[PDB]
């Protein structure tokens, strides 16, 4: 029964233009207002626009009006939305909810779909090796590390001597900045007594790329 | 019928009301009564009886009665805290509620106070929440004051709509008004009865006369003051009362 | 149009009763619209839970148990939300929302509830200074680490010498860890006379009321 | 067996009256028992001196005179003994026990009340690290010394580089000086690899709400 698809998501370069659809089923599509609301990864909901049964009541959102474009085709049971002139911010997850009028609430949204604004292409990372020193170390243990930054293609590795070490090497979840380029740290904690002692390289590898190379962490000078 | 917000107001008057073809028709989903318990109606006379009629939803009947708050008895419809009526509801799915939405039932949901009982207010000025003058356009905190059922029906009970109306009676301070109907059994004769002819109260034998009153009297008197002949209402028939047998 | 403010991240443990709140702006007497209540766990569209508005004025949403009830306090322009005996599955984001004309759709900001199944931590902290080879590379960039910090609200502020700042940090939602504990991280951009133009820089991180601090000097 | 909450060491002035409070736990309606109060002076034996249970059902002790009166207050789980006018003869333990079922015999937890009979004081702190001989002795033991804090309700705290520690550390009760104030010391025992292992500690005292603390760094 009533349920609710959508599709178009994907990844675009800012000042281009977009369109997504959402093909409902079940229900009898022509009798119903529909909505779109978007909302940003690890952020709130936010509406963005509205459709009346093709009352043609559009009513946008202040932030999204003159860039964006709400339409309906109840012959297919569809709904459209069409994006241009991408600010590079409207990077989010959109959903196509339902509009119960008479109670005054949505239902039956749609699982959503991804867009992402980006303007990266591809990069190599850039290492640094994060030393183990006395603010790192409180007693039998110190902490040294890795820091792997500013590379687009999402998936890299950071191990620690070959795959050796498993013990304290937590590598941190990468972060995104503003300049559309990742960034994370990989940090691993050993005995205080073995700061320089034995090895500790850590092995940077980038699949997208070709990548590979090896960064010896030393005690600070 | 007619909207919440803009409810009528119709003035029963000088009639024959029978209270009974209403309370026990069982097509009511809601009958209650407050200043007057109902089976007693068909049995007292006031001066005027008010009906209100309007449509709201299912689960809003809740609100059309003494003390309540909510939106619809805070500015659509306010019953007064004394109130003597009765207020009866039946669900009308079928002749309000249609495909693609019946959106030509309104309600206000915007006020500045609420409404004083039986008050009514279908201005259509721009609401202005905040502090910000609205001008007469609409905006952030500038709200228009109406909004509109959407009916459909395929809703859920407590979301159909359901059809309301209100009576009110009320005693000014004049001669008289509506009241019940009254009924009437058979009139025997020839043997001592007790009886009552639209008022006269008495008793005794009943036999048919051939006295002629002038039509517009209704009892004969005799000297010394006593009711000795009657006219029936329905037949228009005279009747002498001669007292039962005593010695 | 108006703000819902929300506070984020409230927190209770099963069978207790949590107590979410949502205000309007000093203006707008709450006790004049009617608040509509959704809930939305994670890899998932939200779902509505009920809206409230002047008792004897109430209303639920069709699959949701009597446990989650609407109230509304006037004197502080706050609708409430109430969640009576918490289960391990309530952990989800509750956001408020009012309906006035439809011509705009206002929702709240966001509010976490996690029901604790388990007991508290301490945020672990660790600061470092950037590296050399970053010192010659003409950058700095310093990298403030937090992990096993159970509940998941933490913030996290930056100091300069002895003033806050607020410009060229990055700050990594929590991510839940194998021991079901999260971990975080944030990144500070320097240039190197700006490194070596204040004595000392730290990393503070605010969890449940409780700060711990880090703090690092060039050289 | 439940355990009676007391909190240490109140205090106040001559002619004023101090409020003590006995608490129970979560569980119990101290509105169900009968609280007993014990008063104990220095180098002496306790002593009885009143009980309550719902006025109406009070009692004293053959010598208390009516300064000290008990009462009981039903939403904090509380019974309270009330001193009004305080005198110079009530520096003294003081101490509610509760007896059900004569099968045990509850005692509380003991409270110091002290008549200010001088000026506050300000509890001058003085910290010293291992010595060298004792570094060279395979050991080592931080001392913190404090002195002159004339109300004698003092208590301490023992801090490596940003954690606190509860490992190894001895503390003296106050003792009262020449000038009739006080002075307490604490060690904390330490190997001196734990000794560099941390870049610095430190030792904390909290009087009367009021903190001052003193750190000392490995060389
Ligand atoms: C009151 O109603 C009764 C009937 O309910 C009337 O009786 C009728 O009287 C006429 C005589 O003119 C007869 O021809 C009819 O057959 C009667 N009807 C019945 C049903 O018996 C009576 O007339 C009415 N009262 C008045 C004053 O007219």
């Known amino acids: 029964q009533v349920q609710l698809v959508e599709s178009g998501g994907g990844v675009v370069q800012p000042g281009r233009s977009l369109r997504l659809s959402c093909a409902a089923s079940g229900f009898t599509f022509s009798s119903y207002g529909m909505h779109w609301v978007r909302q940003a990864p690890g952020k709130g909901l936010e509406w963005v626009a509205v459709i009346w049964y093709d009352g043609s009541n559009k009513y946008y959102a202040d932030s999204v009006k003159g860039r964006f474009t709400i339409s309906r085709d109840n012959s297919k049971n569809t709904l459209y939305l069409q994006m241009n002139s991408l600010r590079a911010e409207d990077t989010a997850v959109y959903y196509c909810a339902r509009w119960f009028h008479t109670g005054g609430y949505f239902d039956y949204w749609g699982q959503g779909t991804l867009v992402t604004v980006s303007s990266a292409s591809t990069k190599g990372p850039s290492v640094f090796p994060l030393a183990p020193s006395s603010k790192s170390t409180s007693g039998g243990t110190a902490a040294l590390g890795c820091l792997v930054k500013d590379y687009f293609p999402e998936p890299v590795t950071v191990s620690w001597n070959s795959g050796a070490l498993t013990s304290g090497v937590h590598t941190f979840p990468a972060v995104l900045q503003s300049s559309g380029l990742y960034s994370l740290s990989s940090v691993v904690t050993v005995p205080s007594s073995s700061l320089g002692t034995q090895t500790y390289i850590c092995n940077v590898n980038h699949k997208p790329s070709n990548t590979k190379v090896d960064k010896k962490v030393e005690p600070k000078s | ?247 | 149009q108006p703000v819902l403010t929300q506070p984020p991240s409230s927190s209770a443990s099963p069978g207790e009763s949590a107590r979410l709140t949502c205000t309007l702006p000093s203006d707008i007497n709450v006790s004049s619209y009617n608040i509509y209540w959704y809930q939305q766990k994670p890899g998932s569209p939200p779902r509505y839970l009920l809206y409230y508005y002047s008792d004897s004025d109430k209303g639920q949403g069709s699959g949701v148990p009597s446990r989650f009830s609407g109230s509304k306090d006037a004197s502080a322009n706050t609708g409430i939300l109430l969640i009576s005996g918490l289960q391990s599955e309530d952990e989800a984001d509750y956001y408020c929302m009012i309906w006035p004309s439809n011509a705009l759709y206002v929702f709240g900001t966001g509010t976490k509830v996690t029901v604790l199944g388990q007991p508290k931590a301490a945020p672990s902290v660790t600061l470092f200074p950037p590296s050399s080879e970053e010192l010659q590379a003409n950058k700095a960039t310093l990298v403030c680490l937090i992990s096993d910090f159970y509940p998941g609200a933490v913030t996290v502020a930056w100091k300069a010498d002895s003033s806050p700042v607020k410009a060229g940090v990055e700050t990594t939602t929590p991510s839940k860890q194998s021991n079901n504990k999260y971990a975080a991280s944030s990144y500070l951009s320097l240039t190197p006379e700006q490194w070596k133009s204040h004595r000392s820089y730290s990393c503070q991180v605010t969890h449940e009321g409780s700060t711990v601090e880090k703090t690092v000097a060039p050289t």
Do not use: M
């Not at chain 2, 659509?76 to 309000?96: E, H, Q, R």
């Open chain 2, 1 to 247: 019928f007619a909207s919440v917000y803009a409810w009528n107001r119709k003035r029963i008057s000088n009639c024959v009301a029978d209270y009974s073809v209403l309370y026990n028709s069982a097509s009511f989903s809601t009958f209650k009564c407050y200043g007057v318990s109902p089976t007693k109606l068909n049995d007292l006379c006031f001066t005027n009886v008010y009906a209100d009629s309007f449509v709201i939803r299912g689960d809003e009947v809740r609100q059309i009665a003494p003390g309540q708050t909510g939106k619809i008895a805070d500015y659509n419809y306010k019953l007064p805290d004394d109130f003597t009526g009765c207020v009866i509801a039946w669900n009308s799915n079928n002749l309000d509620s249609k495909v693609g939405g019946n959106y030509n039932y309104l309600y206000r949901l915007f006020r500045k106070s609420n409404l004083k009982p039986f008050e009514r207010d279908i201005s259509t000025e721009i609401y202005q929440a905040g502090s910000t003058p609205c001008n007469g356009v609409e905006g952030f905190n500038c709200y228009f004051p109406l909004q509109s059922y959407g009916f459909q029906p395929t809703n859920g009970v407590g979301y159909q709509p359901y059809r309301v109306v209100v009576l009110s009676f009320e005693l000014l301070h004049a001669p008289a008004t509506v009241c019940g109907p009254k009924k009437s059994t058979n009139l025997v004769k020839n043997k001592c009865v007790n009886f009552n002819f639209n008022g006269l109260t008495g008793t005794g034998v009943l036999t048919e006369s051939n006295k002629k009153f002038l039509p517009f009297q209704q009892f004969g008197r005799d000297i010394a003051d006593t009711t000795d002949a009657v006219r029936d209402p329905q037949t228009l028939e005279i009747l002498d009362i001669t007292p039962c047998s005593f010695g």
